[PDB]
Each structure stands twice: as structure tokens, then as C-alpha cells.
């Protein structure tokens, strides 16, 4: 069953061996009933949270985010290739944004040819600076991060998942409400077709070049891990000598564990931020995160910089042996590496104790996923 891409999101169907069921309505009356109630254009906006469910899925979303940037220019032949795929094109090639020296179209003009009717929305791109609308340039955005669609034409801004996704007030939700629902079916189809066919010209990848920071960043990461590790060791030598004082409301041990978890979470956050200041704007991890298509900043921090503290039941790796976590550690070792903090990243790879502690955290996640299903289904059954 070849079915389309944007219908993946309401179905939660990710094509990795998923099989679907297809019923045929036998009467003509129930055929008209399904056509007038349960068509997927008539099921774009959900009643549960008054927002759409379709949205624009991953590869169309990154390609449309790279497409609608300010520095995207299109030759006449590439424009005529792209406009071949618009179903709703009235046959008029638009006037170029650059007439001389060369007739050269901006990608926002082709995207304005996509956007149907005359709809008007103002959204913000995922990396819009919050201090931009305070000072100047709040209408002439220097990062091109303020989406304005106006009179059915994309004035400005880069379209991330906050513009085309399933968030409420997005461009597709307003295209549902102001225009029709057949028109939004056309809008989804036109976005998918013409942005995939631009993506053939552009091309999009991910690689091992996208997972390596320059050596100054690695020096920053290792200096931060060394500083936080020495800080945890000096908290430990304060805790042994009874110089640690208890926080009001808990024991001295829970005070200690708050200090150690606070230092290690600060280390994870500082190394995560210092990793993600070094993508150089072509890194494809940043290309998928900024569009919001697939992943987050945490995945960038864990691939480049540091995996971080591994947890089992919301606290650290417990002492399964007698007063030690693994038989490689000395007894009563409350340090970072003994208790499950992983200082390596997925680019460098984990040491075997960090591998095993990481496998513990992953087993906790899989146990959650496997035990959740029956109880949630039974709650749904009782409610219905």
C-alpha cells in the first residue's frame, strides 16, 4: 500500500514493516458516507486539541526549511522544473526577484506560488532570537527568522515546524480554516512534490563530518569534564570529613546526591551548549534540529560532546554488588565514573563500564515502553 507521507503522523505509521488494514465499503450509501465524513481532507484538524494532525513530515520539512532561506536562488530552468509540479499553478511564471544580471528567482517566490488563496499569518522560526522584537529590525529580520505570509504570498521568514507543522495557528491550520479543505489537500500535495523535486537539485545528507567538532571545542569539552570531575571529588572529600552541611529538609546523603547531580547536570548542560555553538551552519544535525523535523539539541550534545549521567529509576546507578556498582571499582565509590556518569560521546565511544551503565538506562527505557502499552489500552477501553 503506497500511501502518502503526511498521513504518517495521524496513523503513527513509520514504514519499517508496518502493515495496514484496508476495508472496502460495499454499498454505495456507505461509500458516500465515508466520502462525506471520513476523508483525510475532512480529518485534517483534530477536535482533541483544535490543531492539525497532518503537518509536514521530516524530509519535506528540512528541504522546505533549506528552500525558503534568504540565500536560495533558482535558475530559469530549475524554476520551470519546479513549477511543473504545482497542481494549482495558473500558468504564469512570476517576475524574478533578480532581473539583472541574470533572471534569478528566490525560493520564497515559488513557495508563494504554493500558498493558496490569500491567507495571512505571522509565525516565528525556531531560532528566532527573543531579543530581536525588542530593539530594531523587528520588521526587517536580520536572520530571516520571522515568518510573514501575507495576501497569500510569503513575504519573509524561514518555515520550520512551527510554521508548517502540527502546532496550532500554523500555516496549514489557517489554510484549513480560511480556505477550504480540498484546497489544503492540494497545499500538502504541492509542498511535498515541489520541495522533493527541489531537493533533488539541492540534496541533503548526514555524515560523520556532521558529528565532529574542531579541536578547540573538544578542548573546551574536556576542560569542562575535568573541572566538574575535580569538583565532584572535592565535594566528596568535604562529605567524608563531615564538612558538608545538610540542606534543610533531607539527610546528609540526599544533600550530597543533590550536590553531585547538580554539578553533573551543570556539566552536561555547559558542555551541551559549548558543543552546539560550533556547527558552522552547514552541519546536518543542525539542519534537522532547527527545522524540528527529527531530533533535538540533546542528541547533538550527546553525539558530539557527552552522553551524560545514566539513570536507573530517576537516581544514579545503584550498588548492585556489595557497596560498589561494578567489580572494577573500589568499594564506596561515589564518584562520577563509578556511579554511571558517562563523559564520552557517541563519536568517541564508551568505555565498557560506561557501555554497561548506558545499557542499564536503555533497559529502563525499553521496560517503560513495553509495560506502558497494556495499561494505556485498558484506560482507553474503560473511557470509551
Amino acid at each position: 500500500f503506497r500511501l502518502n507521507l503526511s498521513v504518517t503522523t495521524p496513523y503513527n505509521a513509520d514504514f519499517d514493516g508496518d502493515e495496514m488494514n484496508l476495508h472496502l465499503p460495499q454499498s454505495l450509501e456507505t461509500r458516500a458516507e465515508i466520502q462525506e465524513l471520513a476523508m483525510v481532507p475532512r480529518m485534517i484538524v483534530t477536535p482533541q486539541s483544535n490543531r492539525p494532525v497532518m503537518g509536514i513530515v521530516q524530509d519535506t520539512l528540512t528541504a522546505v526549511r533549506k528552500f525558503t532561506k534568504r540565500d536560495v536562488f533558482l535558475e530559469r530552468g530549475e524554476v520551470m522544473n519546479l513549477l511543473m509540479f504545482l497542481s494549482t499553478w495558473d500558468g504564469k511564471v512570476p517576475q524574478p526577484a533578480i532581473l539583472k544580471p541574470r533572471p534569478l528567482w528566490t525560493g520564497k517566490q515559488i513557495f508563494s506560488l504554493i500558498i493558496p488563496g490569500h491567507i495571512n499569518c505571522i509565525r516565528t522560526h525556531s531560532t528566532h532570537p527573543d531579543d530581536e522584537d525588542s530593539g530594531p529590525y523587528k520588521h526587517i529580520s536580520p536572520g530571516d527568522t520571522k515568518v510573514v505570509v501575507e495576501n497569500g504570498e510569503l513575504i519573509m521568514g524561514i518555515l520550520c515546524k512551527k510554521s508548517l507543522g502540527t502546532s496550532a495557528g500554523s500555516l496549514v491550520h489557517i489554510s484549513y480554516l480560511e480556505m477550504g479543505h480540498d484546497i489544503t489537500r492540494l497545499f500538502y500535495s504541492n509542498i511535498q512534490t515541489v520541495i522533493n523535486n527541489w531537493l533533488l537539485i539541492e540534496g541533503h545528507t548526514i555524515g560523520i563530518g556532521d558529528s565532529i567538532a574542531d579541536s578547540k571545542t573538544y578542548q573546551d569539552i574536556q576542560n569542562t569534564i575535568k573541572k566538574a570531575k575535580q569538583d565532584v571529588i572535592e565535594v566528596i572529600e568535604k562529605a567524608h570529613n563531615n564538612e558538608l552541611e545538610p540542606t534543610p529538609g533531607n539527610t546528609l546523603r540526599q544533600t550530597f546526591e543533590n550536590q553531585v547531580n547538580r554539578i553533573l547536570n551543570d556539566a552536561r548542560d555547559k558542555t551541551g551548549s559549548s558543543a552546539q555553538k560550533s556547527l558552522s551552519e552547514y552541519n546536518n544535525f543542525k539542519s534537522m534540529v532547527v527545522s524540528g523535523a527529527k531530533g533535538s539539541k540533546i542528541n547533538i550534545s550527546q553525539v558530539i560532546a557527552v552522553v551524560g549521567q545514566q539513570n536507573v529509576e530517576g537516581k544514579r546507578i545503584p550498588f548492585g554488588f556489595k557497596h560498589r556498582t561494578l567489580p572494577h571499582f573500589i568499594k564506596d565509590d561515589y564518584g562520577p565514573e563509578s556511579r554511571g556518569f558517562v563523559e564520552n560521546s557517541y563519536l568517541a565511544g564508551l568505555t565498557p563500564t560506561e557501555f554497561f551503565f548506558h545499557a542499564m538506562g536503555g533497559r529502563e527505557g525499553l521496560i517503560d515502553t513495553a509495560v506502558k502499552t497494556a495499561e494505556t489500552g485498558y484506560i482507553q477501553r474503560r473511557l470509551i
Binding site: 490569500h118 495571512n120 501575507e150 489557517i174
Partner: protein
């Protein structure tokens, strides 16, 4: 005071009415006092609505779900009817009320 500045439609000022309305509508507003009474009564209703909302919403937030997106509809009317909002307008505020 921000509520009274933003919603009252102060009619006594000449020059603001000259900038916002056309001169026949300006002398229509400034001459008649019945229209001034109806504008004062709709500001009375908006003070009443403000007190009703502050009883309904004791937490100071206003992100509320409602059917017609009125600001987007006003902006659609602007873009369809080609307003050019630098010029003085030509709808009578008693037609609005």
C-alpha cells in the same frame, strides 16, 4: 489607565478625529451628542466586561479558545479591501457600534 487610553474613543480631540476619520464623519461625531452618549455607553459596557473577565479569570492570562479568529479576519478584510491605513477612514463609529 491603559484600558481607558486604548478603548475609550476620546471624541473631544479635534486633530485625532481629523487624522482618523473623514471630515464629514468628524463633524457628525463632534456635532451630535447622542452619538457621544452611545460611545460612552459602549465604554461603560467594556468596563462591565472587564470586571466580568476579571471575575472569570483570576489568573492573569488570556489565551482562550474561541471560534472566529477576529484579528485575522480584520487583517483579511484589510488585505482584501486595500485599506492603505495612512489615510483617514470612512466608516462611521456608530455603524461599528
Amino acid at each position: 489607565k491603559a484600558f481607558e487610553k486604548k478603548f475609550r474613543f476620546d471624541y473631544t480631540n479635534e486633530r485625532a478625529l481629523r487624522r482618523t476619520l473623514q471630515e464629514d464623519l468628524v463633524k457628525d461625531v463632534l456635532s451630535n451628542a447622542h452619538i457621544q452618549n452611545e460611545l460612552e455607553r459602549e465604554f461603560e459596557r467594556m468596563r462591565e466586561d472587564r470586571e466580568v473577565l476579571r471575575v472569570i479569570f483570576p489568573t492573569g492570562d488570556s489565551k482562550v479558545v474561541l471560534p472566529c479568529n477576529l484579528l485575522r479576519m480584520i487583517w483579511n478584510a484589510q488585505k482584501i479591501f486595500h485599506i492603505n491605513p495612512r489615510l483617514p477612514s470612512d466608516l462611521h463609529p456608530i455603524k461599528v457600534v
